[PDB]
Design a protein around this nucleic acid. Structure first.
Ligand SMILES: [Zn+2]
Ligand SMILES: [Zn+2]
Ligand SMILES: [Zn+2]
Lengths: 41, 157, 193, 175, 152
DNA sequence: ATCTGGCCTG
DNA sequence: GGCCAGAT
């Protein structure tokens, strides 16, 4: 999935943790929104 | 500097990163706003009938598929892996008994973890994949229990 | 990152594996620490180059037949021995098409020879067809190809494969002789009896 | 000669040990003595004092690619049959075929009623050898059995290959 | 067999080995019989005439100004893989350990005493270990009193 | 002088 | 698998 790979790649800026976190954020919309807000913040 | 507190808490909450790792990541991202903005601009770039997560009420499995075959999956990572596999045309525990209606064979796609073992024992047509040796590699790079089970699971051909 | 086929598996005594692959850019040899045969795979090489990542793009399930496996190994070895970098962009699609044909068709020998003749033509080893072909040249010596065989060979060498198939619906012996004359003996030639 | 021999062993430790051996003649002589002391059973193929192993001095038989595999199997403890040790596997790329294996030695030990475990490698070549031996046995009137394909113990689904999973599915068993 | 037992004993006795590793290598050599005699023949260079180091030939590459002092060959190999220094060197036959009982009389240091002639600078390439550092400092003090320049 | 539990490299 | 810190 494109957004998944984009997330794993941004997190890579190991791959297994990058993947686990991308999956978690995909499965936790609220937490991912809060993280995007804090990053904008 | 009070703004960074919420960011540190947010990164701390996710599993696999400690509070000091989160603080280090926040500090590294504080003076590197170039890739912080790149990540922010790159960020943008489950149905009851299945249990699959997808945009929209109906998943792509619901949206050329049959209701005859239903497989129970432990985690959605395995669901994505089997979607990358594509060997079942069918649709994709405690609630299994009251989902038995409309199901004529039960597919068990759960992993072989001890939790899956206990769930299977508790739940005791139903089918389960076999225990055997993998493909490729070297016979000297295996484990004793797998050898024994393959010797006793030896099939006739 | 590169995309290619698996045509060589040499086990290494230290538990590693020697891999031989060909891409549309040319053949190569690679090694792996500690991907099955005849699989179209996309792989990333690090430098003999050491493979780091591999992605599977398809499996030919029907190759497990003994004769079919032998013919596929023959075709792959001939392709590798003819896998020049200049001809690689031509041979690679021909390789894939021949493998698909030998996997799907009822008689593997038909698409096998069909792909092999075209690979020989495109690899700079085109025989001179101007009834028995010797060292790639027709004459009174060599394997008796016959008028029908000569006509089918000319049609395959000149017409595209679509209408070349009906013509070919013994040339294998002539192709093997020509390849041996051009390049020398073949390791896999012992299997067929 | 020393560097290559030390590297053949399955870098810095190899070198330190070679240096120590150079500085410790007695250990090197003892090792040469043990090596000469060390310098396959006619039927089983395992180790043996002299000619026949203590076991030799049988309805089940296990075909095996190498002696290491035989020993692994015996360590497993789930096999008390006999063995026939081949010289390897078929390989056109290495000029290995019916004229290179011990087929005729195999046929001197086989009988009509028997089961031959097909413990070949899990490759295209090992599978081709398995099918070939099975066909040769069905021609010669003997049962053919094949170990179960499937998932290994302790294996995760995410990291399993698509072929292993497909075989697991196709070979699924009732419970 | 008993030969396998003694081979495993010999392998375990030598440093830097595991008993499981020893057993697995014994089984591997039971599997490979040509590698046995190959290692046997590869098993069978002496002390340098001047320096006394192991030499591929007649002189060690050190001989073929600067003077470094070490205790093990591993230090020399780390130096050569670094490869920033070309002057003379040395290897010592021990380290002055109070609990072990090693004494300066057991050291090879009169060779260093005569070698002192025509030495512009000396580097104390001692091991980071505290006892080795103390021994190096004590030798450097014993050599400073003679009137030679000592550098770190 | 002995002995338990944490650590790094693999 | 193998080496070290700290209490008895
Ligand atoms: Zn759905
Ligand atoms: Zn025996
Ligand atoms: Zn010297």
């Amino acid at each position: 999935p494109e957004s998944l790979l984009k997330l794993t790649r941004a997190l890579s800026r190991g791959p297994k943790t990058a993947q686990r976190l991308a999956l978690h954020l995909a499965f936790h919309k609220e937490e991912a929104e809060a993280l995007a807000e804090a990053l904008e913040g | 500097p009070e703004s960074l507190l919420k960011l540190t808490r947010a990164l701390s909450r996710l599993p696999g990163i400690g509070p000091k790792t989160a603080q280090r990541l926040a500090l590294h991202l504080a003076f590197h706003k170039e890739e912080a903005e790149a990540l922010a601009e790159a960020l943008e770039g489950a149905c009851r009938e299945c249990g699959n997560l997808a945009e929209g009420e109906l998943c792509p499995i619901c949206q050329d598929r049959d209701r005859s075959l239903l497989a129970v999956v432990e985690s959605v990572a395995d669901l994505y892996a089997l979607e990358r596999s594509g060997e079942f045309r069918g649709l994709y525990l405690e609630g299994l008994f009251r989902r038995l209606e409309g199901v004529e064979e039960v597919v068990l796609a759960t992993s072989m973890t001890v939790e899956g073992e206990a769930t299977a024992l508790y739940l005791a047509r139903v089918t389960r994949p076999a225990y055997g040796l993998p493909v490729g590699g070297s016979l000297e790079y295996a484990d004793e229990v797998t050898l024994g089970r393959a010797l006793e699971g030896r099939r006739p051909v | 990152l590169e995309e290619g086929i698996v045509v060589g598996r040499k086990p290494l005594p230290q538990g590693d594996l020697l891999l031989r692959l060909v891409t549309p850019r040319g053949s190569l040899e690679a090694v792996v620490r500690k991907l099955s045969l005849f699989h179209h795979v996309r792989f990333q090489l690090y430098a003999l180059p050491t493979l780091t990542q591999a992605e599977l793009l398809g499996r030919l399930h029907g190759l497990e037949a003994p004769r079919r496996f032998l013919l596929a190994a023959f075709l792959a070895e001939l392709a590798y021995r003819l896998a020049s970098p200049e001809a690689a962009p031509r041979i690679y699609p021909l390789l894939v098409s021949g493998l698909r044909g030998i996997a799907k068709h009822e008689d593997p020998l038909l698409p096998l020879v069909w792909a092999g003749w075209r690979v020989a033509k495109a690899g700079g080893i085109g025989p001179n067809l101007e009834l028995r072909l010797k060292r790639g040249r027709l004459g009174e010596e060599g394997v008796y190809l016959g008028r029908e065989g000569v006509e089918a060979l000319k049609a395959t060498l000149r017409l595209p494969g679509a209408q070349a198939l009906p013509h070919l619906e013994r040339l294998f012996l002539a192709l093997k002789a020509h390849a041996e004359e051009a390049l020398g003996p073949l390791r896999s030639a012992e299997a067929i009896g």
